[PDB]
């Protein structure tokens, strides 16, 4: 496998990214306060008519193509429909630097609150965020969810990633080794976890299961910090140093 960067133009330190069903790829352009797509084959991203970010991080879409921002500067999260015109203000409280973003089935809302060292979710309508039953997070970062409402978080800090099923209130360690100030964190439909090891400038992946991950064979990465996975298995990483996304086929 061979990768292949993405024909992005004028990013400035990248941060989420995210990839529908449709293969379109959704990439926080945190330094330029926007958030831009791409349509799978396309040349010419376009900009997402959001107003008012200030240093933007994550990213994540629903199967409806509503696209969830977190507005790290501003402590908040902000959504924005399908071909909609105006943004609206998702009704988290207490939100201080708050980094990764992702959103289930059905439409519950997950943020990592980094400035807070936990993880919140708020139901599709409802303006009462609950906190995730996680314990001893240290400016945690990316937030994934998968199809059976396992909670996954990099808890950056602490150099390894620490997982939630649906329902339970005990996380456990996944057995990554070797990780350093770890960044995005997502999963596919089977399970396989996929880590931007930001400080070893690689990309990490970990099939259910198992105690051995494996490096994915992305080149020249720079600071990467987000990571998404499309139904096909491809992974897309933001190589947030060198102002570029890079994707690999599986």
């Given at each position: 496998?061979?990768?292949?960067?993405?024909?992005?133009?004028?990013?400035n330190?990248?941060?989420?990214?995210?990839?529908?069903?449709?293969?379109?790829?959704?990439?926080?352009d945190?330094?330029?306060?926007?958030?831009?797509?791409?349509?799978?084959?396309?040349?010419?991203?376009?900009?997402?008519?959001?107003?008012?970010?200030?240093?933007?991080h994550?990213?994540?879409?629903?199967?409806?193509?509503?696209?969830?921002?977190?507005?790290?500067?501003?402590?908040?999260?902000?959504?924005?429909?399908?071909?909609?015109?105006?943004?609206?203000?998702?009704?988290?409280?207490?939100?201080?630097?708050?980094?990764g973003?992702?959103?289930?089935?059905?439409?519950?809302?997950?943020?990592?609150?980094?400035?807070?060292?936990?993880?919140?979710?708020?139901?599709?309508?409802?303006?009462?965020?609950?906190?995730?039953?996680?314990?001893?997070?240290?400016?945690?970062h990316?937030?994934?969810?998968?199809?059976?409402?396992?909670?996954?978080?990099?808890?950056?800090?602490?150099?390894?990633?620490?997982?939630?099923?649906?329902?339970?209130?005990?996380?456990?360690?996944?057995?990554?080794?070797?990780?350093?100030?770890?960044?995005?964190?997502?999963?596919?439909?089977?399970?396989?976890?996929?880590?931007?090891?930001?400080?070893?400038?690689?990309?990490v992946?970990?099939?259910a299961?198992?105690?051995?991950?494996?490096?994915?064979?992305?080149?020249?990465?720079?600071?990467?910090?987000?990571?998404?996975?499309?139904?096909?298995g491809?992974?897309?990483?933001?190589?947030?140093?060198?102002?570029?996304?890079?994707?690999?086929?599986?």
């Amino acid at each position: 496998n061979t990768q292949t960067v993405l024909p992005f133009t004028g990013l400035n330190t990248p941060s989420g990214v995210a990839v529908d069903s449709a293969g379109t790829v959704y990439v926080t352009d945190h330094g330029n306060n926007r958030v831009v797509k791409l349509a799978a084959g396309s040349t010419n991203q376009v900009t997402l008519p959001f107003t008012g970010l200030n240093t933007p991080h994550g990213v994540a879409v629903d199967s409806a193509g509503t696209v969830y921002v977190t507005d790290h500067g501003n402590n908040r999260v902000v959504k924005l429909a399908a071909g909609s015109n105006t943004q609206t203000v998702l009704p988290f409280t207490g939100l201080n630097t708050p980094s990764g973003v992702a959103v289930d089935s059905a439409g519950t809302v997950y943020v990592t609150d980094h400035g807070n060292n936990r993880v919140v979710k708020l139901a599709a309508g409802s303006t009462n965020q609950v906190t995730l039953p996680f314990t001893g997070l240290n400016t945690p970062h990316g937030v994934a969810v998968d199809s059976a409402g396992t909670v996954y978080v990099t808890d950056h800090g602490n150099n390894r990633v620490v997982k939630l099923a649906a329902g339970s209130n005990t996380q456990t360690v996944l057995p990554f080794t070797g990780l350093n100030t770890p960044s995005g964190v997502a999963v596919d439909s089977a399970g396989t976890v996929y880590v931007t090891d930001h400080g070893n400038n690689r990309v990490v992946k970990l099939a259910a299961g198992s105690t051995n991950q494996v490096t994915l064979p992305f080149t020249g990465l720079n600071t990467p910090h987000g990571v998404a996975v499309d139904s096909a298995g491809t992974v897309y990483v933001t190589d947030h140093g060198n102002n570029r996304v890079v994707k690999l086929a599986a």
